[PDB]
XYZ file of N, CA, C and O in Angstrom:
736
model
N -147.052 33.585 -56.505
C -146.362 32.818 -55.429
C -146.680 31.332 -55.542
O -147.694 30.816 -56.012
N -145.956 30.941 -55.186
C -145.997 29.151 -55.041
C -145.271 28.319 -53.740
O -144.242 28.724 -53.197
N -145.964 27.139 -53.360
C -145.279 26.751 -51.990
C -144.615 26.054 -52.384
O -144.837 25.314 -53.342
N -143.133 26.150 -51.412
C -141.786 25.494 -51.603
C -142.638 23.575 -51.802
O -141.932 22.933 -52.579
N -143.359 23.072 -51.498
C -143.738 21.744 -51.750
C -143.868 21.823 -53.552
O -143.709 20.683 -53.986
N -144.007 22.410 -54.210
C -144.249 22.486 -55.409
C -143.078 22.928 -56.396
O -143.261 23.202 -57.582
N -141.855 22.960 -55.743
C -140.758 23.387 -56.408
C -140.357 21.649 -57.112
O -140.786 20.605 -56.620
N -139.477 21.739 -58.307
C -139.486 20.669 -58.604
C -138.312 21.141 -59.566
O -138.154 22.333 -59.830
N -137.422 20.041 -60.122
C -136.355 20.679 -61.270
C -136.615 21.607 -62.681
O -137.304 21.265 -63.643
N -136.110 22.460 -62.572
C -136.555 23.315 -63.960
C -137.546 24.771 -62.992
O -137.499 25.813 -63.647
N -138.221 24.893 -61.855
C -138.980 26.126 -61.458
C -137.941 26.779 -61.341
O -136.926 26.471 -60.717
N -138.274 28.197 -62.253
C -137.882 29.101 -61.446
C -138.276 30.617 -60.915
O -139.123 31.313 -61.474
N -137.609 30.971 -59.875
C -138.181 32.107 -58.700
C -137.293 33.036 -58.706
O -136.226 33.091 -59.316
N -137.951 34.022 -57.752
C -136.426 35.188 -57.597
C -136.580 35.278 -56.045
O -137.571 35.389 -55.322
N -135.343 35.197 -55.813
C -134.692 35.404 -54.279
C -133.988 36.041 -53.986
O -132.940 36.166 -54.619
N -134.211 36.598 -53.095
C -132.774 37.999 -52.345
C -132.396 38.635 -53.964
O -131.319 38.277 -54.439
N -133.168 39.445 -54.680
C -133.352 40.197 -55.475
C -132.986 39.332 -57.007
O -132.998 39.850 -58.123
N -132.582 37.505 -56.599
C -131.569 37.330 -58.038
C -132.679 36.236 -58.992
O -133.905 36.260 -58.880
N -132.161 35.624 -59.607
C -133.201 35.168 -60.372
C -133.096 33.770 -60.264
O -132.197 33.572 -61.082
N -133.376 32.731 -59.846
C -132.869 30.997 -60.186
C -133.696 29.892 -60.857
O -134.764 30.166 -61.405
N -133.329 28.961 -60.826
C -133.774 27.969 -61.657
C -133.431 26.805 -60.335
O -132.279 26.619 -59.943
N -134.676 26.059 -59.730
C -134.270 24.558 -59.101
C -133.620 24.072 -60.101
O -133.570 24.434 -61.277
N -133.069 23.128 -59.485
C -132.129 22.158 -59.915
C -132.305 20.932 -59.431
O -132.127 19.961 -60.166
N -132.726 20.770 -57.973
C -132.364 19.423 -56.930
C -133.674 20.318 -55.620
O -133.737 21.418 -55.071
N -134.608 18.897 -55.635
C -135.482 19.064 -54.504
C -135.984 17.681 -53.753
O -136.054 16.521 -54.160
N -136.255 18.199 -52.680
C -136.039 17.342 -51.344
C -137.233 17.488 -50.693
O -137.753 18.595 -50.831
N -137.920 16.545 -49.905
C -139.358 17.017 -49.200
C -139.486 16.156 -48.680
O -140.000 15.098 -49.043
N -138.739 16.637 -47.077
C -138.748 15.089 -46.307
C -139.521 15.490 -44.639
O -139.478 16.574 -44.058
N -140.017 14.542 -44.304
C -140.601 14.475 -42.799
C -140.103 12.816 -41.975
O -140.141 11.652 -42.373
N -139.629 13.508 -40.600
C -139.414 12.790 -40.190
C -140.209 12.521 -38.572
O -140.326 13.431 -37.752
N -140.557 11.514 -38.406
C -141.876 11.114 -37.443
C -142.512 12.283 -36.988
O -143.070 12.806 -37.953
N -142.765 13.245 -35.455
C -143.491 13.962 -35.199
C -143.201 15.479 -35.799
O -143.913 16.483 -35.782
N -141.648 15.210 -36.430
C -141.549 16.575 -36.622
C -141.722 17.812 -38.382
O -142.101 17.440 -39.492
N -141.408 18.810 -38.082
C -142.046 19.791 -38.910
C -141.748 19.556 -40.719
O -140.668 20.054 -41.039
N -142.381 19.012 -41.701
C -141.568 18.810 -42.871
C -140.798 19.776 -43.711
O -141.168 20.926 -43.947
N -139.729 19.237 -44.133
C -138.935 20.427 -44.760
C -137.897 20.686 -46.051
O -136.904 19.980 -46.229
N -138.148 21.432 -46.636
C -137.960 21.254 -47.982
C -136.594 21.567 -48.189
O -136.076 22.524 -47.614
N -135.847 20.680 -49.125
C -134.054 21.060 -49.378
C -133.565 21.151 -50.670
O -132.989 20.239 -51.263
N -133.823 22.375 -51.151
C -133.654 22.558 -52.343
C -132.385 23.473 -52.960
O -132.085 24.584 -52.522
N -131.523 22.612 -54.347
C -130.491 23.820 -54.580
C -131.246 24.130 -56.300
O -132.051 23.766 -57.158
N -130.316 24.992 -55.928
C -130.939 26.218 -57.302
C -129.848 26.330 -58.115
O -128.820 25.773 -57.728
N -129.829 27.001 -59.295
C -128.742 27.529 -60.058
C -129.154 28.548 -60.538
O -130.142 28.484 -61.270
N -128.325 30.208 -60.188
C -128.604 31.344 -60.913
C -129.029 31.343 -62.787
O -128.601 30.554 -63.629
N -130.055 32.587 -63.005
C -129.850 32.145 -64.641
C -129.320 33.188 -65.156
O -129.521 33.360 -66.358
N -128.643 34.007 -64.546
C -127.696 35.248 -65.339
C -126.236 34.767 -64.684
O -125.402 34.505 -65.551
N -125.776 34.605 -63.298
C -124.525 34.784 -63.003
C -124.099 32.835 -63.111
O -124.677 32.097 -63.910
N -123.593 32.607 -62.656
C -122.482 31.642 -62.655
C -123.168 30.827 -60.853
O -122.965 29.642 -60.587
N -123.785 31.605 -60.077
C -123.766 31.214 -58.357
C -124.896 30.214 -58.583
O -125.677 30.203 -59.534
N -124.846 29.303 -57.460
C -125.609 28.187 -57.098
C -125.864 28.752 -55.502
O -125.257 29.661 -54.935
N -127.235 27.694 -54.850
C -127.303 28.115 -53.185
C -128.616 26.847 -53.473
O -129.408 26.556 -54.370
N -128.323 26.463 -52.392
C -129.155 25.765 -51.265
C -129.620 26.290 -50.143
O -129.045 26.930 -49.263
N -131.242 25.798 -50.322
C -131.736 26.683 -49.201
C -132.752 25.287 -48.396
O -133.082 24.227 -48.928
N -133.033 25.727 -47.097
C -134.033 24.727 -46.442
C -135.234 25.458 -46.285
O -135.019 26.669 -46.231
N -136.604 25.090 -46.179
C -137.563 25.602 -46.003
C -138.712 24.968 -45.388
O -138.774 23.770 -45.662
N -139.706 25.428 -44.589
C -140.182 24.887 -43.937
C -141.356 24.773 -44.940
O -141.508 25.666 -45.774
N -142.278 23.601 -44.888
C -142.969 22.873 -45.693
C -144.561 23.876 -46.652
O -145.285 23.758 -47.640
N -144.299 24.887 -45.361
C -145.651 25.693 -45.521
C -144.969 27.319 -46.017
O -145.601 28.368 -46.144
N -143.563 27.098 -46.221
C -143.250 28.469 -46.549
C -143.467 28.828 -48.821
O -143.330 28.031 -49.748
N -143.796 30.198 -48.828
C -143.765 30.334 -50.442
C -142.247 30.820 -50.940
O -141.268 31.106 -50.251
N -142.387 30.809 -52.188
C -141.365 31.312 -53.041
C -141.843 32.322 -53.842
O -143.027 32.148 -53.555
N -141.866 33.255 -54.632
C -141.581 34.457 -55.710
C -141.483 33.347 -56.997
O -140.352 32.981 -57.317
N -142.499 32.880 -57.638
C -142.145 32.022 -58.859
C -142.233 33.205 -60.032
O -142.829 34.272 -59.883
N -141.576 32.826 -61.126
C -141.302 33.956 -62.511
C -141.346 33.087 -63.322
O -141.134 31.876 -63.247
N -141.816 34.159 -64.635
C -142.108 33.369 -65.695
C -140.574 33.936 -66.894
O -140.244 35.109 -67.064
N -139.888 32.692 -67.555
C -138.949 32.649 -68.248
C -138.983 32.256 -69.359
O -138.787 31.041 -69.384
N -139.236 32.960 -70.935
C -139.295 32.028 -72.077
C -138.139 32.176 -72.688
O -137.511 33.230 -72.601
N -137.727 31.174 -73.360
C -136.619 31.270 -73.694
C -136.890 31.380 -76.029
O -137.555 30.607 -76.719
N -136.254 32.331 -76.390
C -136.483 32.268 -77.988
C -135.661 32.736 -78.226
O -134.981 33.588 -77.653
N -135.537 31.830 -79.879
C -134.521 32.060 -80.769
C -133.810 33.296 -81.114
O -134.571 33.994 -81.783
N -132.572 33.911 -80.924
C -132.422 35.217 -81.566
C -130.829 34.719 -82.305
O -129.932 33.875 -82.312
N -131.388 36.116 -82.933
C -129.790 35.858 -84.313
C -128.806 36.964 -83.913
O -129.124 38.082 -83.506
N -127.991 36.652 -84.028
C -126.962 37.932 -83.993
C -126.640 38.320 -84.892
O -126.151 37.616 -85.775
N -126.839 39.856 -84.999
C -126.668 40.591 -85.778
C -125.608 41.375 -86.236
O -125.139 41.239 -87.366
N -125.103 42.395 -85.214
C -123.406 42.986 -85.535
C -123.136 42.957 -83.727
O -123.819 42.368 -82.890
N -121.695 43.952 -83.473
C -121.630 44.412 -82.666
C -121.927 46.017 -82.291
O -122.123 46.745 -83.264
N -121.987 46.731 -80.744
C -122.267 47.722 -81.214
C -121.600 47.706 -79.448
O -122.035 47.131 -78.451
N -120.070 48.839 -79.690
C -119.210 49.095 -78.215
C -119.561 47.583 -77.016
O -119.044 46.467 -77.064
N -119.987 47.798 -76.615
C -119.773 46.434 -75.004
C -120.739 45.704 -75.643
O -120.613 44.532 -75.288
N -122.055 45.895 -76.769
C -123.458 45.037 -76.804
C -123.447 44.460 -77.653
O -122.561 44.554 -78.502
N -124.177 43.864 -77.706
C -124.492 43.053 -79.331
C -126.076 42.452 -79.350
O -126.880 41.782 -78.703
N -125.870 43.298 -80.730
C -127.273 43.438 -81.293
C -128.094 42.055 -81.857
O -127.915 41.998 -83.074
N -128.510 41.494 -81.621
C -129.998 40.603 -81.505
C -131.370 40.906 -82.108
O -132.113 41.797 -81.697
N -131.682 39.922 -83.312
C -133.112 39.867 -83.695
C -133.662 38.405 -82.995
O -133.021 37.371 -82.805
N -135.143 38.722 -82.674
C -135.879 37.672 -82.309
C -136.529 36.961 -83.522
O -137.543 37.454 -84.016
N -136.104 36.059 -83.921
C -136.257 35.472 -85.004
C -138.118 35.219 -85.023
O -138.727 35.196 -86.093
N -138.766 35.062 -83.780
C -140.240 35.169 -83.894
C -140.706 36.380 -83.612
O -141.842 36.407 -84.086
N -140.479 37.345 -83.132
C -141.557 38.418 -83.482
C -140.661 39.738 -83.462
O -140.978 40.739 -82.819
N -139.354 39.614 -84.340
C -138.610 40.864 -84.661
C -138.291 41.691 -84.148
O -137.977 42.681 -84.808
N -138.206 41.722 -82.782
C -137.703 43.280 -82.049
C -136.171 42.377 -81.716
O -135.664 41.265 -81.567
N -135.933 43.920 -81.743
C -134.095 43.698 -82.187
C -134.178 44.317 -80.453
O -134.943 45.074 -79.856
N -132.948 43.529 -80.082
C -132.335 43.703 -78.483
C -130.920 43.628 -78.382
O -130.246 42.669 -78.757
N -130.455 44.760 -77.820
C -129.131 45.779 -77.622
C -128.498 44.481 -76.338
O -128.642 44.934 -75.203
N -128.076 43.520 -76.344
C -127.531 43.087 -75.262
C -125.979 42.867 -74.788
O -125.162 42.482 -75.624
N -125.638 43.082 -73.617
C -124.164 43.231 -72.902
C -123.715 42.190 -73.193
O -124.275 41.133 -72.901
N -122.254 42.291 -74.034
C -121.397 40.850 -73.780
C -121.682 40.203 -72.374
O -122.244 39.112 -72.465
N -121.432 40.611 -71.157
C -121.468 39.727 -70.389
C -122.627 38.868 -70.432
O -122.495 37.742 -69.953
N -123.601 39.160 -70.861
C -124.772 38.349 -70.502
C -124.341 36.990 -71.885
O -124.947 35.928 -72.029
N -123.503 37.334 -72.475
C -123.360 36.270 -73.758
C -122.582 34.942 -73.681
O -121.383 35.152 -73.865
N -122.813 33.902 -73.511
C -122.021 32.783 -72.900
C -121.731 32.697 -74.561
O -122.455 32.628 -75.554
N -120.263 32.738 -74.319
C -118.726 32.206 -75.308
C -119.530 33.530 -76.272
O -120.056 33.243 -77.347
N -119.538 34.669 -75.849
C -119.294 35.599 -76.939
C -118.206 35.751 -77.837
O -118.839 35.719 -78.893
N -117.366 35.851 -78.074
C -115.712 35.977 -78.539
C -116.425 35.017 -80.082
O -116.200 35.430 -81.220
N -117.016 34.122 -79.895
C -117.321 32.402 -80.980
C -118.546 32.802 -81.595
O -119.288 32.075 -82.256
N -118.680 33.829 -81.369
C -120.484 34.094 -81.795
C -119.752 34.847 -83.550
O -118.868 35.691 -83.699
N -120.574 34.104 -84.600
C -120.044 34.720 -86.527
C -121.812 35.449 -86.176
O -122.805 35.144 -85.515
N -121.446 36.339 -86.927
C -122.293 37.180 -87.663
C -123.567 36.616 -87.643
O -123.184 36.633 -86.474
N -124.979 36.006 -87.739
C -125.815 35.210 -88.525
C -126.344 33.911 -87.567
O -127.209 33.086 -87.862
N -125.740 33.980 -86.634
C -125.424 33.042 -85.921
C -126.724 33.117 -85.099
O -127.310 34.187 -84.934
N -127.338 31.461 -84.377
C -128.417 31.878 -84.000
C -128.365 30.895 -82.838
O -127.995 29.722 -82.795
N -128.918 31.849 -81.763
C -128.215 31.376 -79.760
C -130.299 31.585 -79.423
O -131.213 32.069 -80.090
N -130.216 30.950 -78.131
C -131.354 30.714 -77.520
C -131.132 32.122 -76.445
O -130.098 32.245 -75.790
N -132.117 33.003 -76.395
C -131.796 34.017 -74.996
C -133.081 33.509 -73.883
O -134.273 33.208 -73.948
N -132.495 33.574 -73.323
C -133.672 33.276 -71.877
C -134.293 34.839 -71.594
O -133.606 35.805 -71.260
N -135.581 34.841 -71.785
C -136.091 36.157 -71.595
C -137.075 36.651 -70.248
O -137.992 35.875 -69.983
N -136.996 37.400 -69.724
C -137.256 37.984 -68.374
C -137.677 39.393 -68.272
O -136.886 40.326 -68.411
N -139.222 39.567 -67.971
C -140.190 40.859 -68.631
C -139.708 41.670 -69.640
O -139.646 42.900 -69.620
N -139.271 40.703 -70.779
C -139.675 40.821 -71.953
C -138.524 41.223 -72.716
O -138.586 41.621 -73.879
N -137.072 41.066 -71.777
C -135.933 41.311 -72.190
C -135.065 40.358 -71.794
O -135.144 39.939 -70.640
N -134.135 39.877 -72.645
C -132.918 39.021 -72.420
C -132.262 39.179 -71.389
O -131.948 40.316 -71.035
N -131.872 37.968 -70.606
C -130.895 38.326 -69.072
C -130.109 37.247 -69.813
O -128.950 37.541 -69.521
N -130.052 36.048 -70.692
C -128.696 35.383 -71.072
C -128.874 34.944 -72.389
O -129.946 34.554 -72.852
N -127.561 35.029 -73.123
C -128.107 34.360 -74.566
C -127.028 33.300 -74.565
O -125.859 33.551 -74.272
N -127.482 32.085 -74.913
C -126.355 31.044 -75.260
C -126.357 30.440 -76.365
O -127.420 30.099 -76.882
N -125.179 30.198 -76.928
C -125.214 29.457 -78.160
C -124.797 28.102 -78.435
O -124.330 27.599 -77.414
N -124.786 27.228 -79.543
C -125.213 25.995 -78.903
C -123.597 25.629 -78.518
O -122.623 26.295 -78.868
N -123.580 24.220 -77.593
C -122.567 23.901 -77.119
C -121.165 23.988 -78.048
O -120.071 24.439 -77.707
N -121.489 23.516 -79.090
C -120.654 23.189 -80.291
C -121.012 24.181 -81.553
O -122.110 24.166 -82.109
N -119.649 25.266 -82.020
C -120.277 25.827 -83.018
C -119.152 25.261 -84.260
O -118.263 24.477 -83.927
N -119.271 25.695 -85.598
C -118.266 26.128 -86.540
C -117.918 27.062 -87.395
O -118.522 27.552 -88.350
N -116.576 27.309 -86.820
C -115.817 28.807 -87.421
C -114.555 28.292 -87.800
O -113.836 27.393 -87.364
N -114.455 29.388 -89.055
C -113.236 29.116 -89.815
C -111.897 29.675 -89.133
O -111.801 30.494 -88.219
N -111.056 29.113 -89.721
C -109.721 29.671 -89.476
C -109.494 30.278 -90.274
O -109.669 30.117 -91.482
N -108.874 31.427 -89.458
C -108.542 32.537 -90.728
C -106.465 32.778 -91.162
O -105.821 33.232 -92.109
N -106.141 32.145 -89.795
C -104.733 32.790 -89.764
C -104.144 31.732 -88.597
O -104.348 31.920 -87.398
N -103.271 30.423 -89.203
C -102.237 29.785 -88.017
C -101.204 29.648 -89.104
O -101.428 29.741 -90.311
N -99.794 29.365 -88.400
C -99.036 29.127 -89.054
C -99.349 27.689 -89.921
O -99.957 26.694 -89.525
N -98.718 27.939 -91.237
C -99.093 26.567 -92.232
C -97.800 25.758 -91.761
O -96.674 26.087 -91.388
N -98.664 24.211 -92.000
C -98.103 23.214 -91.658
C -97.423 22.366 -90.051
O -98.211 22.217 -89.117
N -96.633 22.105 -89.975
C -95.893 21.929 -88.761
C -95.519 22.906 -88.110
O -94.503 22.573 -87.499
N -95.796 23.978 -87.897
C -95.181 25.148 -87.607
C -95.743 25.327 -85.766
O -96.251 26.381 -85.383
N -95.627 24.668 -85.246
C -96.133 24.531 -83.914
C -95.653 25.764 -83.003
O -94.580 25.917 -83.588
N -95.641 26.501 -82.269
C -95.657 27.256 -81.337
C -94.391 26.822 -80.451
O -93.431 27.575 -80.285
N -94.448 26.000 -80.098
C -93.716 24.963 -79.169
C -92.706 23.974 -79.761
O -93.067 23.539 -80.854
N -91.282 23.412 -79.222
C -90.689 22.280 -80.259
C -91.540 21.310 -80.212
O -92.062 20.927 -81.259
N -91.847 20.723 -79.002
C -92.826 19.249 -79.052
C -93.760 18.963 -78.920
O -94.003 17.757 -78.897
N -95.139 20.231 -78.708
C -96.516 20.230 -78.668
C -96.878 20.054 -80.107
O -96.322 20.391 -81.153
N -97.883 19.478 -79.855
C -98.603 18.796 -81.020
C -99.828 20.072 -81.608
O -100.698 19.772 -82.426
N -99.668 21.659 -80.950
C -101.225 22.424 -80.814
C -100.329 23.676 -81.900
O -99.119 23.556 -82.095
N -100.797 24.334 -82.254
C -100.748 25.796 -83.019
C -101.663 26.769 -82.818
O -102.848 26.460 -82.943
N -101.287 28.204 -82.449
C -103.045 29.025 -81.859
C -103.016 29.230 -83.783
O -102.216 28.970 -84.681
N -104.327 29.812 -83.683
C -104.978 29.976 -84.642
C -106.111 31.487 -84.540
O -106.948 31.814 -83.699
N -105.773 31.951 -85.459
C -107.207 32.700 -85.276
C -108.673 32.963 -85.785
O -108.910 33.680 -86.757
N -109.339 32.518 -85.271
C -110.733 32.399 -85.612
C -111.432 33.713 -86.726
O -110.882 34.806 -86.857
N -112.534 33.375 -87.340
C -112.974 34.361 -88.074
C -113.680 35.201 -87.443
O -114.269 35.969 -88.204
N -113.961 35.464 -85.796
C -114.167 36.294 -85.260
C -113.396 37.087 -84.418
O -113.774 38.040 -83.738
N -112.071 36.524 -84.540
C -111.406 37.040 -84.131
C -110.263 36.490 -82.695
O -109.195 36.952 -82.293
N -111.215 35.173 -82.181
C -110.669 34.771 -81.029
C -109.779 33.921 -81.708
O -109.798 33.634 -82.905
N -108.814 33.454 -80.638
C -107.672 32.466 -80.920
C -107.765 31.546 -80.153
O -108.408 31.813 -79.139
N -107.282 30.311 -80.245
C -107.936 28.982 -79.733
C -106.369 28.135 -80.347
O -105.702 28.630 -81.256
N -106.025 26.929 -79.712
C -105.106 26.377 -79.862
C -105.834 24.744 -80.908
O -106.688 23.967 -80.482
N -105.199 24.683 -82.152
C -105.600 23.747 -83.039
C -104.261 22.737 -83.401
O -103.083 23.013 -83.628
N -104.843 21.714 -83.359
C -103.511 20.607 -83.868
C -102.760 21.343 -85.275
O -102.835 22.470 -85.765
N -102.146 20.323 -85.571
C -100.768 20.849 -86.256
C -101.283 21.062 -87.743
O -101.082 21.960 -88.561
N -101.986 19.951 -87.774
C -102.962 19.349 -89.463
C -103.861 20.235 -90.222
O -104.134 20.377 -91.414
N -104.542 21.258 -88.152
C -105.567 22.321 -89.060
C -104.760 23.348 -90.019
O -103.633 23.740 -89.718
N -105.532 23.813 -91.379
C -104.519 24.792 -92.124
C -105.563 26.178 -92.079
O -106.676 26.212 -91.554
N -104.929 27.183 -92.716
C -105.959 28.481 -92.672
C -106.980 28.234 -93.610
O -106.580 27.698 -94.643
N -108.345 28.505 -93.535
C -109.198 28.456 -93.937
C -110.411 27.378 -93.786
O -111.573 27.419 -94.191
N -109.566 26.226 -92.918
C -110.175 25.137 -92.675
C -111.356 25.395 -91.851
O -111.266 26.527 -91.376
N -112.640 24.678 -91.422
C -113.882 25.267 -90.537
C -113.217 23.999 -89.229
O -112.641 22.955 -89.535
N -113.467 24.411 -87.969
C -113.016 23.405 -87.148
C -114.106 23.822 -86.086
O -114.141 25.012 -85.773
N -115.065 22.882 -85.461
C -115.968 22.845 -84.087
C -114.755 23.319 -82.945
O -113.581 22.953 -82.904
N -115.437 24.200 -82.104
C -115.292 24.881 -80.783
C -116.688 24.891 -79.369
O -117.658 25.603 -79.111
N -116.234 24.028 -78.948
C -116.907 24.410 -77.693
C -117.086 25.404 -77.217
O -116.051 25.949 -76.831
N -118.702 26.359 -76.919
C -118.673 27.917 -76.602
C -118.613 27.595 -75.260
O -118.364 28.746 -74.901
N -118.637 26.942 -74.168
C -118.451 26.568 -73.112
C -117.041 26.754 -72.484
O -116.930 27.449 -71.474
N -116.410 26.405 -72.815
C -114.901 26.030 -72.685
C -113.664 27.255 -73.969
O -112.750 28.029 -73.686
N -114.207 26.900 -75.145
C -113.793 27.853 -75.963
C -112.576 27.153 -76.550
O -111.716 27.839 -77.102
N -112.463 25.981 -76.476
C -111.555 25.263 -77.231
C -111.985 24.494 -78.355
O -113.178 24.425 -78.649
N -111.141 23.943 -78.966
C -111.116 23.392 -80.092
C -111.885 21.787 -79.898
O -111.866 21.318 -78.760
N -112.279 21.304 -80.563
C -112.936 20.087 -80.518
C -113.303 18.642 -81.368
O -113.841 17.539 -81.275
N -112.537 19.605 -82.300
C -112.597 18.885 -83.954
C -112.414 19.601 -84.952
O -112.181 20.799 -84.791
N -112.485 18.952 -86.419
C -112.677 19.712 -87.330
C -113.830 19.496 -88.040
O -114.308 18.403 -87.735
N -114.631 20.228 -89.062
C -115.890 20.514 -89.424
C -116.293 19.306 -90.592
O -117.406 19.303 -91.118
C-alpha cells in the first residue's frame, strides 16, 4: 500500500478490481481545510481513463509492472505466441491484449507490460515496416480522383497507400492508427 500523497506520474495501482497507471496529480490544501489529492489515471489493459479525489491520508493498492522485450512468434486460433527475449518462457497471449495486432510480421519484437508474471498488453513500436504484397500496379487508384490505393500487407492487413507505392515495396505503418505513413 501507498498514500495517495505519494502518487506521482508513471505509479501504478489497482482499483475497483482494474489495473492503472497515474498520469496527472494534484495535492492541494486550502487554508483550514482537509488536503486533497486529484488524480487521473489511465487503464493499462483497456482503453478507460478516471479521475479520482482523495483525501490526503487515504491509501491506494500500489503493483508492481515490468515491462520486457518479447518476440512474436506464430499465431495460434484468437492468441499469439510470444518469447521473452530475456529469460525464454514462451506466452500464449489474446489478440485483444495486442495493440495493432493485424501489423505484427513474424520475428517482430513489441514491449509486453507484465503483471504476476504474465502479459496484460503487448505493444509494438509506434512505427513498423511491412511489405506490400498485393495493390494494383501503377495509377490504378480505387477511386477516379483519390490519390490512395488499398494494398495488402505481408500480414495480411490492408491499409490505403499512395498511387507510387508498387507490390513489394516496404512502406512504415503506424500500429496506433494502422495507416500508412511513408515509405521504408
Amino acid at each position: 500500500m501507498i498514500s495517495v500523497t505519494d502518487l506521482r506520474p508513471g505509479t501504478k495501482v489497482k482499483m475497483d478490481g482494474g489495473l492503472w497507471e497515474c498520469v496527472e496529480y494534484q495535492h492541494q490544501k486550502l487554508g483550514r481545510g482537509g488536503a486533497k489529492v486529484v488524480a487521473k489515471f489511465k487503464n493499462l489493459e483497456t482503453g478507460a481513463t478516471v479521475e479520482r479525489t482523495f483525501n490526503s491520508g487515504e491509501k491506494l493498492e500500489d503493483i508492481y509492472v515490468e515491462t520486457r522485450e518479447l518476440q512474436y512468434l506464430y499465431p495460434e486460433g484468437e492468441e499469439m505466441v510470444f518469447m521473452d527475449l530475456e529469460t525464454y518462457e514462451q506466452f500464449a497471449v489474446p489478440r485483444s491484449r495486442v495493440v495493432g495486432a493485424e501489423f505484427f510480421k513474424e520475428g517482430m519484437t513489441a514491449l509486453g507490460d507484465m503483471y504476476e508474471g504474465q502479459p496484460i498488453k503487448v505493444t509494438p513500436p509506434t512505427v513498423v515496416e511491412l511489405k506490400v504484397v498485393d495493390t494494383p500496379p501503377g495509377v490504378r487508384g480505387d477511386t477516379v480522383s483519390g490519390g490512395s490505393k488499398p494494398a495488402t500487407l505481408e500480414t495480411g492487413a490492408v491499409v490505403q497507400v499512395p498511387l507510387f507505392v508498387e507490390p513489394g515495396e516496404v512502406i512504415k505503418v503506424d500500429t496506433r492508427t494502422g495507416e500508412y505513413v511513408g515509405r521504408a
